[model samples]
Target: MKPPFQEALGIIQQLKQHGYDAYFVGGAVRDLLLGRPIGDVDIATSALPEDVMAIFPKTIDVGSKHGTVVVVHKGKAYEVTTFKTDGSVTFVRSLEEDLKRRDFTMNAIAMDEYGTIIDPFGGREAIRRRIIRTVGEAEKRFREDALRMMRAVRFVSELGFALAPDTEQAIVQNAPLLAHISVERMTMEMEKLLGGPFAARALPLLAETGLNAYLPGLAGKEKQLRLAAAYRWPWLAAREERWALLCHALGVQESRPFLRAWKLPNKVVDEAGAILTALADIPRPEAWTNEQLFSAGLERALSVETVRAAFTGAPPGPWHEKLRRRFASLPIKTKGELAVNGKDVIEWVGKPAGPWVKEALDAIWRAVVNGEVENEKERIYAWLMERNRTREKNC
Candidate 1:
């Protein structure tokens, strides 16, 4: 899927044919120049948004007011932005403007259509040296957009680069500005940092910058921050559940507090809550019983395994492989595999909607998972009756 910088080649060529300045720009170009895999394509051009829209046959004004547009081909989106260095007394500017306003010099660099490296700020050298430096005055850039403070750490995590002394200092100096930034945006930047290869480095940077304090449920305990460094996050998941788990290890109990801060959907909050519960309680693979896995259901159970892989240091090891194999050996992926139904319990005990029905179902489900009884009706009835009798006597 990645062949040099060909993804933006067509867009650049189209702009060139129409006598408009165009070139592959921003992170897409920076990643390609560094010989890293490029996941997105961004093209910078001289034409305004409306002009660009007119030139392209299939285009959308995804960022019309911001001077950016999207061209779709074969169901894939390519972001194209106008080129004009931003620096007005009042607001942010175009691609050229945004580039100058960028946090790090490495990301601030751009490229021309034929792959000629553009270094208005020595970004190429910064990349060569594997150092993350501010584009201009470190303090000024951070003041423009406080989120850049987190973005600085995220870039370090993604590129496995060390932040230049000045840039790192700038981030710490402006850490308080993060209070003004929206929680959702801050959460996104944090997720990107966690999703990167150097998450081990990124998590510590987050703590060092004093962000964990502002984040709800992460008050004082350094242990959760340490766990985030140790565990190494994988993806920028939908619900931010993975990060929430890292936060939970530190004692963040009420999920709504963080979700409300970010204005996230209820569903996302619920997913994050479920993930937090699993992460907090998942048994060690060696000690994991079939009942535990079955109780988790298919999806949560699989996520529990994934979290285990993350917790363990040695990947490609016997212990990890064994855990995977054990999970794969489970039966009854769906509820249909269970022979007992609510009606069966109701008919047998004549109990209306009450605790007994749930108690009965749990008993049979555990038996099935534990291999004590097959998914057979007669065995389920006996199992339920036996458990209910024991419960009645205890009560």
Candidate 2:
């Protein structure tokens, strides 16, 4: 009945008119039942991917081997997939059979266009109890896809639900299976888990289930991992911020290799590294310097402040605003904004093009940034000449 489900409902109606059994399915159904906002509404139909493609005027073969297609109707896209058996593309006798193949009970429920609930696996009951229960035997479900173990941990954080006792045991038993999954898959799940509101609660579960040992650059650091997990991070906002917290907690001096092991995007890794470095050298909140703030940039500086607040309970209150003002007041934000370029330095100083050109420019940029000289070309040239004369006199 909402904007997203409304379009989903029309697609289900069209599928039924073509004599195919279709229902809104998967995570969207679970989110709807929990009164949470649903993002993508996927339809599980008895029709194969090809059949669904023919039924819709505009469709894309997003994953035909897995029996999934993107059905575009009236400018909105819905994922339409045929009932799959485990990981393979196969026709199921009924929707219940497809539901049986799902990872968790809360995610197994399906609803028709008229709001009919299909609860063959007690999915609604699991949702009502705020529990995460696998559809079949817990170990069996995990063996089907090792990534489900990571998903189970993420759901605990995202939904703030406890894993069923049987499911918990099974995850511990099958946590080693995660070694077979790709790092890309692991990284994606880890990001979502860290970004969840209740990540602090879920982080310890990874260690308890023996999942931490399998993570990259985390071996032999169980005590630190537990310590990191015990810290509350209600104020943590972004995934990069959470990563910076993890780095600080783990006492990672050099995070490039560690972050690269997780295959995070270069931009995220670089920003996280900046925050971590700034956190290591940050002075007391009241003693922060303009040079430090400008060097870290506004975003990374605020992330360091947030991490500091989490540890000291200093309260980020006015630090964010103060840092923003300090950074805004910098003479030059980057080398590009500097008044003189390397070529300008070489031309004015009468130095042939060589490494000294870059060296002189670096000196000029630093002087301007520290407010020792004006950023105008004349002032920079004069400062460079004065510095050279001083060096000659000393030599």
Candidate 3:
């Protein structure tokens, strides 16, 4: 076990040894059952929320009202919740009320510290079948909470598990229900779905279930191509990368607005914009040269290669490595790395910070990119002087 999780588990064990019933809960337990590596460990115990806080004073009462408290040990936090039928849920929920309200059956299974499986509501059966089904009546559960619609799709994306026919039907039938939900919640779930290893499954499912209509880039002619590109690149890890690639491939203008419509972070919106624009200019990944790769940055280039591998049907493993090494060896990845800035170029050209400054900077960037000039202050200065003289004379 990694330190983060090991530390959490130790706390849970300690809690149980002290006469509290502790069990590893939620996603960690679900992943363990699926033979997947766990990320965070959540512990639920018979102890009341206040009782839990009493034992672990460092615990944060993040959800004490909901019967859950976050216990911290050695700077790591573990959610130590209480076992009950109602009153401890994130969304105005009562105890087991939260359990019944969960979207997927597969995620409903829980476990105790001693490794005993708790199979309430046939969650174990759903896990065994590798399917995501509603705990009870799909429409009733969905009516109480609309975000469950997104969760159903996201769980499939994360687990590569199929949705039970009825559950999927519920999503399609209640497709319009998503409008009642907040765009922020939708965007978060959509991103999580994209960044997962099985995210490819999520996109097409989104389209098929009519969920994409509520999102940007879902209405365009080139949407299919962009979605196809993402599906092809299974290695494209970040959700923002997928969003950028998809938006770019759609030939969308004002890419930032598109992501912002979904309430994405400003950094994500900017990164997606950069990735899409650059990827568009350099259409083919395998043919990208040192100059092109340098412009794309190591992260974006890797994202492009991963998408490229998916599109080409063969992993671009060798080509990907070559691109990585090429970028890593570059002396200047951007204009700032060229030992000069816009002020220096402006002074050399005897011009202000107008279009000419950009033109001069572009010239220097290209020159350095192609190895025509070294990435040093003296050479960059010399090149600027020569180029400025040429520009002045041409005028």
Candidate 4:
């Protein structure tokens, strides 16, 4: 009924008109059956890569070597992959065989453009039961691609499904194989697992299956990791906040090494690090000074407070409202808003363009923030000169 589905259906119809069978497959079908949002609509076709390229006016060879082509139709891109190919195209057999080669039963189903469900495996039944089971022998599937072990845990987090008994055993047996996967690849899956609504259920399974040993800086801290997971993440929590909570629970003294090991983006690493740093010095909502509150910024300060509340079992107060009011009441929100710049400070203090100018301006900004001085250029300059004179006298 949505635009993406309609666009995908058009592509499928075009493939069928070319005397090739194409059907919506993989996550698209699984999500449709589960009544969840369908992010990507992938089509499995009997057409080869070249044939698919020729059929679509706009085609991108996203993974043509492995029998995949991205077809742009009706302003939406759809991955149309051939069902048979050589060279690492795991799901390239016949439709039935391809479904059988998939990682889990719930993902092994297909649906045609006419909305007919083509389930070679008991995928519908598995979805109904809310279970994640390997298509065939669990060990063989995991051994085929070690990342499947991590995928099992991620599914528990994402879909809130219990792992089939055989699948759970296979994950434990193949846990060490995750080391073979790259950190770049692992980063994507781990972030999703942490942000998922049911992440609390999956964290202990990570330890139980020995997968925690493969995660960066998570070894020998299963109990702490589980405790962190048990803390309920508010629905509005950011992804970086989740990482910060986990880092704090593990008692990580430094966040750079731990986050860098996961290959996270610098933005995420820096924000999470700030949250962790703020955790060390959280103040009560009503007792916070402007300098202390603004040092961490409102968002990170609130994140630290939320994590602390969880760990300390203290109920969160009206901290959000009070902190927002305090932030708005500050004299200046950022350095750019300060009346005097570094050059102005250099002129006022009669100093060279060096670190001292920055320190002088920072001192003035702090004074203005605390309402000790008004945020005006002449007043700020006077305040800085007086402070420097006092420091010299003390020396």
Candidate 5:
């Protein structure tokens, strides 16, 4: 047992000594079998929430109505839930009954503190085969909670595992159910799928299972979605980069609106929108100008470069390094970094403090970032004075 699972194991031992059964359960056990680094381990026990609470000195009533209580041990919180036979029930039931309610066969396995594996649903075998199968009837599980279809795809994306034949067919038959799923839930799953290691592999399966049509922003864009799967996914790293690739491949005219419709978080919507904007604002990679770099800023420039490089299968290191160095070499990366503000611009140029302040500031930052003028306050004032004088003479 690794150090992270030690606390949960200890809790299981305590429960068993107190005349109740406990085991490390759910995703933690599945990940353990797959050799993935275990994160949070949950303990499912035959003891009710109150019984577990009575035994523990410190307990949090997070979901007692749902038979779950959080046990804090040495500053780590372990979610100890009572064995539940139904997804919507808070009552205790048999251990095998609890496993029967699990979504996938790979997730239905459990292990005791003694490291004994209890897989009544062939989950261990599924992991050994690198395949994803439902706990029981595939159609029954999908219809019970439609998000299982998307979860299946996300598992493939994350685990790089093949979908069982019946599982894939069940998803195909129930693909339309994805439309009824809330955008919030669907977005959550799709984000994981795109951010996963095998995003490209997941996309073809999504298309094959006919689930792509129900995706929030990708209604009739399956043809273009092929571009996303065909491109080298390793070139794109972050979630925003992958989303921008999807937007570009699907020919999203307005990334903001599309992401908004998907009910994505504001930060994700903002980052993906910025990347798409930079990609459209400056299409030429080799011809990127100082103004474009300034407008895109350093972060967006790097993200755009990465997404663009995915097309040509180029490594992100050179582009990332060059952009960082170029940005670092800029005299003023942001308008606020200039030696003068809007008030200073108005004072030096005798321009009113409305829209002209922004125009003059834009010109000043452009000149400064391009190295045409120094960023020093006196030099910028002199440069602005000289420019105004030239305009007067021309007039």
Candidate 6:
């Protein structure tokens, strides 16, 4: 009854009128049968690219090489792709061939515009039983695309489904082929797994299938990963926060290189690294000092507590409240709150702008944080002057 589905059905009906068969295929069909919400509806049609273009006036070729076109029907965009085999452009006439090329049985089902389920591979039954099984030979599927092996684990995190015994065994056999996959592709799947509500279900499977070895920065750390699986990750809401928890749990010695090896964005790498670094400085099971809380700041400090809570099985919210109260009690929360600026430091030191400005600013903020000097401009200036005299006399 949704507008998008209705529009998709309208397009399929139009295709059928042109003497070409088309139906809602792949994830949409599978989710529909599972009684879950559908995100995008993909159409598989027996029509050639030429006929498809001729049939729809508001169509955009998504890719000429892949034979996929986005047809806009009544303000809804539906991807209508020609039925593909293992390879492209042999666009077969039957929906079975397209279904066969898909990764899993639960995703290979199809439904006509009339709401008739055309499940050639028992995807509906697989969904009913709550399992992830390959449409054909599991080995052939993994060989065709090693990413599917990781996707299999991802499904456990997403759908909370058990992998069919044969599929799980094939993953263990072909796990090494995952080494050939690009880090970005693997990292994308890793993000989904970590962000899933059931990450605890998927992390151990990564080790059991030996897929952890091929994953970035995860080789030789199977025991830690398995142990990590015992903890819940429902508290980790952000994607980068999940990475920070993983990095801290795995005890990654080098955070930057490890995250970079996963081909993560620099911002994610920086946040995870900062969270770990800030966590190392905080006093655990005890209240953190003003200086410690100030150094970590609010964002990084909260991330640190959240990660720590995962291991302690304690609620992060109470810890976060305590951290916020302590943080609010700090003399100065950030450098921006300091009475002086880089220009002021430059003038006080009577030197040109250079690295020493940051050095001087750091000294001032540290002094203010430790309550050795007041945050007032005149008080800080006098403190810096006295410190300079003391250092010069010592020199």
**Model 6, stretches more than 4 Å misplaced?**
2-4, 49-60, 71-77, 283-286, 289-292, 324-334, 349-355, 367-376, 386-395
Look at candidate 2 and tell me the lDDT of residue 127: 91
lDDT by residue for model 6 (273-374), tens: 887777776648366767777887887778788877876788888778888887877788887899988898777778888987788888898899888999
lDDT of 4: 0.81
Residue pairs clashing, model 3: 66-88, 85-96, 86-95, 87-94, 87-95, 232-310
Candidate 2 residues 1-395, lDDT tens each? 66778877878898889898799888898998988889788898988888888878999999988878999988988888888786436777488888888889999999988888898999899999999998889988788788898989899889888999999999888888888999999998988888777787788787888687788777767777677665556688787788888777777879899999999999989888887777778667777675676567677888888888866767887998888777777898887898877887776767678987767776776788789999998888888888888998898
Q: Is candidate 2 or candidate 3 better by lDDT?
A: 2
Quote the lDDT for 352 in model 6: 89
For 89-163, candidate 1 gives per-residue lDDT tens digits of: 322234466577555777777777666777788888988899888888888888878787778878878888887
Q: State which candidate, 1 or 4, has the greater lDDT.
A: 4
lDDT of 5 by residue, 86-137 (tens): 6558566578878888889899999878788999999999999999999889
Error of 4 at 273 (Å): 0.6
- Over 1-395, each residue of candidate 3 has an lDDT whose tens digit, in order, gives 54435667677777777777566657776787777888778777667787787877687889677677888877877777776543234432223544554456666666654567776777777777888888889877777777888878788778888877887788778777778888888878877776766766666777677566756446634357435534563566676667865664555787877788888878888877777777667777657876777677788777766655555566768877888778867767765676778887766657657886777778787888888899787898887777766867899
**Poorest 10 consecutive residues by lDDT, candidate 3:** 86-95
Q: Which regions of candidate 2 fall more than 4 Å away from where they truly are?
A: 230-234
- Model 2, residue 121: C-alpha shift (Å): 1.1
What is the per-residue lDDT of model 4 for residues 127-223, given as tens digits with 9 covering 90 to 100?
9999999988998878778888888899999999999998998888888888899989888888888777888777878888878889888878988
| Regions more than 4 Å wrong, model 5 | 87-90, 393-395
Give each model's whole-structure lDDT: 0.69, 0.83, 0.71, 0.81, 0.85, 0.84
Winning candidate number (TM-score)? 5
Ten-residue region with minimum lDDT total, candidate 4? 84-93
Model 3: lDDT to the true structure: 0.71
lDDT score for residue 115 of model 4: 84
TM-score of each: 0.83, 0.93, 0.81, 0.92, 0.94, 0.87
| lDDT of model 1 at position 142 | 81
TM-score of 6: 0.87
Which number leads on lDDT? 5
- Using lDDT as the yardstick, the better of models 1 and 6 is 6
| Steric overlap count per candidate | 3, 0, 6, 0, 0, 0
